[PDB]
Amino acid sequence: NKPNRISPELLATCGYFMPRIFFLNSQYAPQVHWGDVVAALSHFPAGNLDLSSEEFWYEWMINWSKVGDSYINIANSAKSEVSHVRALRSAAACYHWAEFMYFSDRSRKIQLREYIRSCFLSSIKYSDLLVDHQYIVVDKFHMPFFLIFPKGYKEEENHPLPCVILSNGLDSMTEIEILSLAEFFLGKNMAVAIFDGPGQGINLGKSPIAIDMELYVSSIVKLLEDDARINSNLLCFLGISFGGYFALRVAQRIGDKFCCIVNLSGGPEIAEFDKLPRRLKEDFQFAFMQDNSHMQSIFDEIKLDISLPCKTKVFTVHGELDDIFQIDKVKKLDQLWGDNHQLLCYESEAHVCLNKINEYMIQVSDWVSEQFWLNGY
């Protein structure tokens, strides 16, 4: 018998995704341990090493689902609330990596996201964080919304807090990657607003993702203006990935509502749809609830008019080797937007610079604090 280990071939093949799967060391956001990846991949079928193939991500979903199931069983037999919550968090992380690049069974993907959201709402019950969970009605759309306050927050012993609104990317889950980012702002005694817009979080596969996501952000701003606990003159919008694209839109359309905006590896336009690597064609197809033939036209419409003015301070983190949002288009935007746009460019980093996420989220969090201080906080 050999110890349970990940195949060298598989580890190599998954190199791009390993920084995504581990993500950020987080207190509240579900996170995998190395052993969870071993549990998922130790018995992964050999000869299945094509990141672009449907068969790879089927086995990926199946194997990660097993590890999630194992943690739900630990959670169900847990002898304490603290153990129960630890197990539910581990389960949620495993189910997210099961689903995030799986698009072949719409009902199964939605089921896995429901598992994650059920785990999250259970974790909140036993957490030490004040979570204000509600639906924001935008026209006929009921938008899931979480307003989260720093550790030991009491309204009676605090002035109104600054607030960071954070957007999902194409394939993130709100309580996993976005809550992970949000902890950097909670750690600095800021409120955070995380949300499931159309085609985002729990709504992925239910409603098509909205290109004009600023309309939904506008409704969050209106809520924060009405909340006495929040200083609406100290607001930041942060987007990761495609969420970073929304961050550039917010800068153009409603930028004057924000002291500052953070773009984590979003861009003003996406690379040619047909030539997208890995599973990204199916990823974009699933989010927009459209087939291959309709997607380039959507990419055309997505493309920003970069001459339309940037109405606040923007900080972009981008990788030179990003194959989804090309660095040349980001640098063109950086040049045009001038003193209002700061670019941190990582020379040897792929899409979202995930080898640097710990160091750049330190820098980004301190930059946001500075912009609030520059607006007299």
Next chain:
Amino acid sequence: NKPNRISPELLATCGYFMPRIFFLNSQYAPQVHWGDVVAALSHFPAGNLDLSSEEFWYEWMINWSKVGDSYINIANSAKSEVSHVRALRSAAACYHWAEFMYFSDRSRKIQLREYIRSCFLSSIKYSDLLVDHQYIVVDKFHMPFFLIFPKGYKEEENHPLPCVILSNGLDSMTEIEILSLAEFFLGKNMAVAIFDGPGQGINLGKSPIAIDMELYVSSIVKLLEDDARINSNLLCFLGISFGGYFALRVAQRIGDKFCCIVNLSGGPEIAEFDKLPRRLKEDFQFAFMQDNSHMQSIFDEIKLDISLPCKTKVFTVHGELDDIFQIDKVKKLDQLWGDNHQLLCYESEAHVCLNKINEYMIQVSDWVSEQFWLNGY
């Protein structure tokens, strides 16, 4: 230009150590991100893949030192206390993986452990945990000692707390692996006592490790008896690795002082010294401050008399494929010690079962709580 990645050959070679390096998702204990491992190993010299070779661990120490240095620079330029502490923790983790299997420069290894301890004492200043740091005098030895209380602890609003004493293994650092384990008990509103006995933590390479570590544990017990904040009738001793060996000694010599004892992959005797794999000969040599020729005699003397009675409830977690503490010797002890010894044996797990550490620390923490409840807590 290719994105910074770890060589397939290197990832494969390091498979045994990757679960050790990532360890446990921790709130206080320093922990690496995936990106830190990439920073360490992306430019690791090719053709250097022998885990048993001195040249491998020299380059390992050099490359991990670079990443630690990078985090100290982030810490020194940090614009907030929260950012400063995040950076110091990341630095401490990197310096630990630089040193933990490096024995060739005594002064450099001690220097790296001093860096970690300086980072830790700085992190305590800005932490939300009550840390009682002092020296326990045992004869002429001044033993570094940390009594840590749960989050939001106030003596005036608490009865005396149960306390878990945790021991280092051969190559752990007290504020890294041991504090990581300790968080499972802090999470359950227990006090934790972590310490640097002879040849342990900051004392590794300064004093030879003491085979009779129970003498130093006895002095901790006396301190906890005198502390009004601690219920001395609700004490647990946990050891990891060689620390688990000390846990078996404590069970034999002063077991009646403890409600329960946890042995994380310690054993009653070590495998033949001469045939030890990887860097373990140099590891044991360094800890005992002795040369190759003296080490088998020490292993002889280390070997327990398993007929000497176990004086409390013991829980052992062990891997079938452990190549340091053979499972057959652990199972012999389990049989002899009877109803007072419980064995969790993982069929396909190597030394310390690190692919299972998250799930088994859930089970272990709940088991300790149960033993305190069985002693009327």
